[PDB]
Amino acid sequence: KRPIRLLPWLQVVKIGGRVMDRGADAILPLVEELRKLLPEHRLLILTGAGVRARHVFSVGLDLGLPVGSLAPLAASEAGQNGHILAAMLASEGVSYVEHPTVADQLAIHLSATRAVVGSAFPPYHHHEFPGSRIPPHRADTGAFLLADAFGAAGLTIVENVDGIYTADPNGPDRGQARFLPETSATDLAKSEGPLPVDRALLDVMATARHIERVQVVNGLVPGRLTAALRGEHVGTLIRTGVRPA
Amino acid sequence: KRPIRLLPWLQVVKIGGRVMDRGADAILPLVEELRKLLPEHRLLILTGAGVRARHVFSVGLDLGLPVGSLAPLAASEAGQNGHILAAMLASEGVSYVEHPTVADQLAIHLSATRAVVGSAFPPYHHHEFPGSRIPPHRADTGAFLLADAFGAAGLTIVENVDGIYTADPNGPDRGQARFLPETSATDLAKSEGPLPVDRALLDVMATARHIERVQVVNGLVPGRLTAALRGEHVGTLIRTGVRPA
Amino acid sequence: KRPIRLLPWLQVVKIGGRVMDRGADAILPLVEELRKLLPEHRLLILTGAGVRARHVFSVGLDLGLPVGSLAPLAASEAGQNGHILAAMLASEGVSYVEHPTVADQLAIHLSATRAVVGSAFPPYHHHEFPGSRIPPHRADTGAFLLADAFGAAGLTIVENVDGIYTADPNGPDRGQARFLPETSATDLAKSEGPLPVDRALLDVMATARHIERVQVVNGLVPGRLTAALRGEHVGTLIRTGVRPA
Amino acid sequence: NSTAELEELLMQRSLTDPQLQAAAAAAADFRILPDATVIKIGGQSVIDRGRAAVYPLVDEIVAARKNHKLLIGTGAGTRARHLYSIAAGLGLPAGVLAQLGSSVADQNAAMLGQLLAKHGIPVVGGAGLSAVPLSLAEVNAVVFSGMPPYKLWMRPAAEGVIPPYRTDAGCFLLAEQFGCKQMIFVKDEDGLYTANPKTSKDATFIPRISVDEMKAKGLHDSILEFPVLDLLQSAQHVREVQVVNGLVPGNLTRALAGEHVGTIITAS
Amino acid sequence: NSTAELEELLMQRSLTDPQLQAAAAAAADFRILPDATVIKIGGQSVIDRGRAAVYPLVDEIVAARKNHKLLIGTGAGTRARHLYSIAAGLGLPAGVLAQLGSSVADQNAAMLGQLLAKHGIPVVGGAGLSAVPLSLAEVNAVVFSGMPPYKLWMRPAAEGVIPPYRTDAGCFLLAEQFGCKQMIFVKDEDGLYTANPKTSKDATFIPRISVDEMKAKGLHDSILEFPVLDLLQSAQHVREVQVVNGLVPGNLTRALAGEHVGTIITAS
Amino acid sequence: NSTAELEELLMQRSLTDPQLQAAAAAAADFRILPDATVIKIGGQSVIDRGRAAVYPLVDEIVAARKNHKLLIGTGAGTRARHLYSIAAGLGLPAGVLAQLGSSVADQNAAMLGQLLAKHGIPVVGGAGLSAVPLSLAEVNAVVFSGMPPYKLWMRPAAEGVIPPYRTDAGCFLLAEQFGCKQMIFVKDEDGLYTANPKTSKDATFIPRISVDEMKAKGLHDSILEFPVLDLLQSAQHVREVQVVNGLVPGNLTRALAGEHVGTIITAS
Numbered sequence A, B, C: 001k002r003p004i005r006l007l008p009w010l011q012v013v014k015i016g017g018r019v020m021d022r023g024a025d026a027i028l029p030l031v032e033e034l035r036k037l038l039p040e041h042r043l044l045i046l047t048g049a050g051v052r053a054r055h056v057f058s059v060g061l062d063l064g065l066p067v068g069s070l071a072p073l074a075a076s077e078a079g080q081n082g083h084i085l086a087a088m089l090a091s092e093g094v095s096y097v098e099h100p101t102v103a104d105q106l107a108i109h110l111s112a113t114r115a116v117v118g119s120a121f122p123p124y125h126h127h128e129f130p131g132s133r134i135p136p137h138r139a140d141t142g143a144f145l146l147a148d149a150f151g152a153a154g155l156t157i158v159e160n161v162d163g164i165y166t167a168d169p170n171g172p173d174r175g176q177a178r179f180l181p182e183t184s185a186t187d188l189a190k191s192e193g194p195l196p197v198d199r200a201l202l203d204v205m206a207t208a209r210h211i212e213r214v215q216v217v218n219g220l221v222p223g224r225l226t227a228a229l230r231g232e233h234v235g236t237l238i239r240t241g242v243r244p245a
Numbered sequence D, E, F: 001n002s003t004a005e006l007e008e009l010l011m012q013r014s015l016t017d018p019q020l021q022a023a024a025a026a027a028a029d030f031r032i033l034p035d036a037t038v039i040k041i042g043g044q045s046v047i048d049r050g051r052a053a054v055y056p057l058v059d060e061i062v063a064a065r066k067n068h069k070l071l072i073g074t075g076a077g078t079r080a081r082h083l084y085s086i087a088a089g090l091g092l093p094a095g096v097l098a099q100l101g102s103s104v105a106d107q108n109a110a111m112l113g114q115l116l117a118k119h120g121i122p123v124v125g126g127a128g129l130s131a132v133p134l135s136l137a138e139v140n141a142v143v144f145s146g147m148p149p150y151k152l153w154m155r156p157a158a159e160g161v162i163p164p165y166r167t168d169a170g171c172f173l174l175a176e177q178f179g180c181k182q183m184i185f186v187k188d189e190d191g192l193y194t195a196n197p198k199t200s201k202d203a204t205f206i207p208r209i210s211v212d213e214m215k216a217k218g219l220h221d222s223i224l225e226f227p228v229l230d231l232l233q234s235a236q237h238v239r240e241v242q243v244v245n246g247l248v249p250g251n252l253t254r255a256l257a258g259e260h261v262g263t264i265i266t267a268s
């Protein structure tokens, strides 16, 4: 059998770092939608890194630093994004919590308030896997590892696009990009081109214990996060491979 | 006069380490009974060490380490037992809290949720008293020091036996063991044979400020913890020596 | 425009260190008044240092230590005063919280309970400004910096006197002291004699973003703190210079 | 891959873009601790056995640091296997068990610290950047705990709740990321065999072998945690490892001198 | 001001009392680190530029610590300006932006630590009381982050939400409070000019100038953060500062030797 | 008591079982810091008195560490007695007062650190395992705070809320558990007398005495905290202590040299 579900009533939301990079134009509508969601769900909001992590890679790689050194440096940018977002929701009782509090005390903090914010990056730090000079375990991977370990009700990834395409919709081959309403983690893992989610996310999905699907939706369209949290199909659905019992 | 009662509405429960060592057979019925107690009391649950602490003593003593070194090493095992127990109750809003949070912020955390879990070992660490090569201030002592300092409503010790006998009911002289429904800390301190509670517990009881009695009950029988928290006599009562004003 | 108000529903109260130095005669009536205020406001209570900080200055100055060394040493005394006060209110669910929790998680903690206690000293520490051998950024300054950064509803300073006079009412020239029911931070900054509030408080008021007025009231008279929190004029009003929009 | 192109890709593309990955693969390579050796002291192999096994190794370490810079990691052992049993019987996930195991390896690191304190060798957090002790002839070595920091974020194995990345992985990845020159696993066996020497009588010793050869022999999970073999093949700095018997007096010292005691496992 | 009078005032008067302030001003003066030099390494000036600028300075620092005790602080830079833009656009107060900037300066201090670890130079908190490293010939230097600890208690500027006290103030006040002997700012310009050399062609170099002279020339906010000029005039221990170009190889070393490279700004 | 029997008892019996206690009493005895000396610097006796008392002792410590390894603990003093008065008047328990006292002893340890930093002597947590500083001729000493870690778990006295285990107990138990060779209490009196020298004129000096003799003379709570006398009789490593006058220049140094200054209190 599977491990038990520690927090079966939890809903986890991951905010893309490059969504935050857009500034108030995107954060304010997002903050308004999250305010209205507070009475409806028990939310753990996790933030990604964004462009600032590409700059530290640019500097770190130029200095020749190993992937174990760049991993935690990029994590800092995701934490700072979480502090910004939590600050905008402080009047509603939301604050940022550290990785130790998420791992061991999430139950008390969601009893004290409706939602909390944290960093989506996992604590792999200087023990990151070797191979690629770019840290593989990034924000998408960290959020799913937590959501599945807790046995949460779901994980929703908020992006700056409608979902996953057959090619980069903002890249050189954007003319051939075809939207994918639904896909499986295994099918994605066998394609070569770029993606909007970490490739490590597909690996941990292959060993997932509880979460059956993850939906990628566009946070730049008000209402889709709300609809996705109710199971409405408004983006790309990724089937992890887990079946019921 | 006495010091004031800081938290007069608190009930403290100490779970024996060797109860946790029995595994799911004993933890699951215990977890079910605690779930039903959450709406009835404001609970601080403290866990003991168990057999794993005997193994570190075996290794530490063989290495010749002083009692000040073995004390904190055994404490770690009680903390790990607390993490296991708290994890089973996370869905109900319970989590593990560290010694600093217990000492200084218990009031806020029991306002946020109904109950919390912590380590029963006190922070004597490398300042443990000399004399015996076995650390004297263990889980029973730590739990009573807290309960009495807070002026709690009571302290209940959960064991793997019905109470205190005249001899070890699982030892060589188990044929002569006679159950003791009620006793005083002074009477116990003057006997020589083994006991199911720390001998240091009887010393701190002699200087107790508020708690008048501590009941030792069998956690392997569902319902006795619940009955003991209402003052029902279902185990061994230890009179500390404190009288009313 | 101004920065947004992070916690517009917050009320901040600063307790003078020399009020705590008076002992139970002053703390017990104060604790009773705060108990009755808990259901009425969302309170952040901050404590000052007092006479113990003058003693460490006496020793530190005799040792020739710089102002950067004396600043954090005095802060410790304000923290200890906060632990004493919070302990008296633990039965009502109040506890002491550290500077990091105040800066980043005040929203969650005031959702868990009605009020919390903290140190009024700001973390300038060994980066204190040079010039005077006495640390300038003290308890009054730290409390206003927080209250204004949060955009709170107000800040009330609790003293051992009725308010600000034209001279020290307990000093050599107490015969000429004239009570000041209302004044402006700029007017005060241009006078030379002593005051009951930090002179740095007047500087940060000149750059204040939200708080328009701070009232200084006598905590030795039960009821004035309660009246001041409702905007009643029972002490000295200090106009910071901020106007509405 | 010019830097102007790498920086252009780092700002325009997703990190998953193969061209960005390729551009980053051409970056310079810096070794943080190129002159250090990482050593794992086994939990059950050594530390659980008491003074008979720990005291001789403490003496070896004290004498070895005169000529070799050492980062000494600790395993977990018996107490960790008991925690895994309790938690696993309750149905707790791998991430929770991972947190429990760290407590055991931390205990063992503390006990070694009690014994090594009078020799100037501390127990530390952040062994890879413990710059002061690793630059003093009076010290020249530190002790750390062997479990990795994943904790609740531990990646589960394909089946079961036992954390797949434990003290062998924790110590190895430290050596890899800080560009150390040597990785030595100190166990209670002479090295790799064809069959398990504990449970098989006709086992043959293997002095040297590659990861690919081990898997073909069905030896992927024998004397090392099998995920380490894959980490080894992906490593940038530590391309081979050495497993030695810590219960043989002087085995550790002779390995630090370049003698071919034990088994050497090569990435390729 | 006798001590009996000072202690009498410390217990009878308010700390605002001018007589108490005057009595305290006569106290003895103790320097904690009288033989150390504080150095700021610029974020955008240096660290953001990569190996071309960082590696030469790492080499300078490694060689300089043989003869000079150094406390090396780091600036923030590009990533901090991006955070200020995001937060400022949201209307967040200066105290919140101050917390965001510390994260950048901390990152830069870590990256220098990765490079300096093999030389025995650590990244530390509490550089002013890092007694062990600053007393060893094998070390004799430490790295710290440049932002001050004010965080949400940051005093806002007269206008705007940009924290007015940043890495120039953080490094300077550390040198001042611990009574260091020298403060050196390492930028990407040769020093102070009459006009901005980046945006003006007919600028004239200024080798030496006082705070009062800078303000009269309209140069209060040029190569240094202007609040530092006022902190400088109130300083007890560090009464002048020196700004040098870190992109010139050897400039830092020559400044530590007493050569008049760059610009010297005097309190009076 | 063979180990097989000890391990059999450790797994079958309660830790309260006398046979298990007896078996554990036969275990080997390891000293962690056998060559160190623990010294307490009094709060009111010394530190509260200012430069006249602190500066000479700082000089003594700087010169003494050339030949003696030192762990220097600090007392609390005046500010702690004020906190006890405030809290006690409110009816707060001993455990709360214990937390307040630690803050005072920590302050005093910091102030000594400010003065000793330029000499390479740090203020530390975990003095007993501060391996690096205690193995360097440039350092060879550390400073720590004197209060024990019991905090809210402090055992109350028979009567009153004043914590019975304070800085004398904190420093002594550190010396005992780490197997140090010597314990020196630095007060403001020459040593033990028959009557209180402060409040009695016809007092006679006592150079040497046992714990039992002190109690018979009614001197159990005189120059030391009386619970320390009982801790002394139960000690495994530190079987005697020495009380000296810190206001006499050179008294500390002469005690470290073996001169019989002050009073020696023996366990038996």
Ligand SMILES: Nc1ncnc2c1ncn2[C@@H]1O[C@H](COP(=O)(O)OP(=O)(O)OP(=O)(O)O)[C@@H](O)[C@H]1O
Pocket (backbone or CB within 6 Å): A015, A016, A017, A018, A019, A047, A048, A049, A050, A138, A139, A140, A159, A160, A161, A163, A164, A165, A166, A167, A168, A169, A170, A171, A194, A195, A196, A197, D013, D014, D015
């Ligand atoms: N196959 C694809 N489908 C959709 N988007 C793609 C694809 N390949 C590349 N992209 C690009 O990925 C971008 C999203 O970038 P990315 O996922 O790196 O940021 P993020 O997820 O917001 O940040 P973080 O991972 O730091 O939280 C899209 O805007 C799009 O241009």
Ligand SMILES: Nc1ncnc2c1ncn2[C@@H]1O[C@H](COP(=O)(O)OP(=O)(O)OP(=O)(O)O)[C@@H](O)[C@H]1O
Pocket (backbone or CB within 6 Å): B015, B016, B017, B018, B019, B047, B048, B049, B050, B138, B139, B140, B159, B160, B161, B163, B164, B165, B166, B167, B168, B169, B170, B171, B194, B195, B196, B197, F013, F014, F015
């Ligand atoms: N006089 C006695 N009366 C009852 N039990 C006794 C007595 N003497 C010895 N025992 C033994 O003590 C055992 C309980 O063990 P113990 O108290 O060490 O574990 P625990 O309290 O669960 O663990 P911890 O103290 O680590 O929390 C009983 O099962 C019994 O065999």
Ligand SMILES: Nc1ncnc2c1ncn2[C@@H]1O[C@H](COP(=O)(O)OP(=O)(O)OP(=O)(O)O)[C@@H](O)[C@H]1O
Pocket (backbone or CB within 6 Å): C015, C016, C017, C018, C019, C047, C048, C049, C050, C138, C139, C140, C159, C160, C161, C163, C164, C165, C166, C167, C168, C169, C170, C171, C194, C195, C196, C197, E013, E014, E015
């Ligand atoms: N102009 C003035 N008006 C009123 N009080 C004054 C004035 N000048 C001096 N004082 C004195 O200041 C005293 C208050 O002291 P002070 O403000 O230092 O303590 P506090 O504010 O309680 O302590 P802390 O600042 O540590 O919180 C009054 O009791 C009064 O004697």
Ligand code: MOO
Pocket (backbone or CB within 6 Å): A097, A098, A101, A105, A109, C105, C108, C109
């Ligand atoms: O980080 Mo917290 O643990 O809000 O009580």
Ligand code: MOO
Pocket (backbone or CB within 6 Å): A105, A108, A109, B097, B098, B101, B105, B109
């Ligand atoms: O450990 Mo906590 O302090 O739940 O807010």
Ligand code: MOO
Pocket (backbone or CB within 6 Å): B105, B108, B109, C097, C098, C101, C105, C109
């Ligand atoms: O200090 Mo806390 O963060 O009550 O949960």
Ligand SMILES: [Mg+2]
Pocket (backbone or CB within 6 Å): A016, A140, A159, A196, A197, A198
């Ligand atoms: Mg993405």
Ligand SMILES: [Mg+2]
Pocket (backbone or CB within 6 Å): B016, B140, B159, B196, B197, B198
């Ligand atoms: Mg028991």
Ligand SMILES: [Mg+2]
Pocket (backbone or CB within 6 Å): C016, C140, C159, C196, C197, C198
């Ligand atoms: Mg005042």
